[PDB]
Design a protein around this ligand. Sequence first.
Ligand SMILES: O=C(CCCCCCC(=O)Nc1ccccc1)NO
Ligand SMILES: [Ca+2]
Ligand code: NA
Ligand SMILES: [Zn+2]
Length: 368
Amino acid sequence: GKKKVCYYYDGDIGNYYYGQGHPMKPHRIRMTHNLLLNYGLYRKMEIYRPHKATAEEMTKYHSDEYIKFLRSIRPDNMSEYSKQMQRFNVGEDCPVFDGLFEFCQLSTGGSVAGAVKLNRQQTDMAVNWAGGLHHAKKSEASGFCYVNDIVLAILELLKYHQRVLYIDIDIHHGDGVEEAFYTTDRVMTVSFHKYGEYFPGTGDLRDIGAGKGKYYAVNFPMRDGIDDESYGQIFKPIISKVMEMYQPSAVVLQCGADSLSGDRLGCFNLTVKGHAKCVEVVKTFNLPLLMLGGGGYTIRNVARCWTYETAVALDCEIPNELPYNDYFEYFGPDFKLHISPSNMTNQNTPEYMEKIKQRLFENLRMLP
Ligand SMILES: O=C(CCCCCCC(=O)Nc1ccccc1)NO
Ligand SMILES: [Ca+2]
Ligand code: NA
Ligand SMILES: [Zn+2]
């Protein structure tokens, strides 16, 4: 049936600035919010302002030393932390910016609050577009991510759920999440990503987990230019097999929008409909679902993607003609919600797609 959706957003989020030339723009979360408000989606869901996650919350995963450094580091005292910055990988991809810790606290707070809401059985779905920062490690920032809100949200879910399924549709491999749960069968991690001389360099299909976690990490490595047809060819069959074999009681879906056509950093060719079909596929399983953000660098397309995926979560049809909004000029020259794929070559042949799927199916046969 139609589901109860709780959505997390803090109006301050859009003001956090990574710095001149940095592609990660928290402003895209505000654009997403303003667009979905203008479509009238607030009438169908509960809108919550997340709390600022504390150090006690963050240290359920991250080390005390790393969190203390994030809590202390500022552009004014940077010069006194040169060594600490190199140790925790802060300074280039993961810059020090005003309000960095507070940005982490709000990104994390939405994911953790959403997980609590699902655990209490007070919502069917929880949405946190400021979350999904999949690369952060126990004691290290990485790929524009500092605090792993996903790992913290899954640890919250594990209090009430024996098995939690994690699915990652961002163009980049969900390394941080896969790493945290690599040796456990209590979380199965499933990542679809561009692989081969691409950030972060991990997610080979041969990386399948270790110890009790062997066969509980799934990687689908892809080439440049994947399209809606090819993605759709494998996503439903793989998720269906995962659901059948793994039988999770809760799901976390990372919806990184950098897998869309025309992304500033991405090299895929999905449309918003192709991306959102993933949400529709996961939705059909009727399991408690936490939907998260992630990458996404062509901000107009990020706002379109996450607005449509919120409408999909709500089973609410919305017009293709964009309503007026505070960022209306960003959506030109068309002013439409949906996007067209580019003429880029799809390097993922149908044979390649079927072969990787068959290899992953062999691995899934190894589950109890
Ligand atoms: O989307 C991501 C993170 C991608 C991180 C890519 C790191 C390399 C990079 O492009 N860094 C960079 C570029 C311009 C300015 C500063 C850093 N994960 O899902
Ligand atoms: Ca991914
Ligand atoms: Na695992
Ligand atoms: Zn990404």
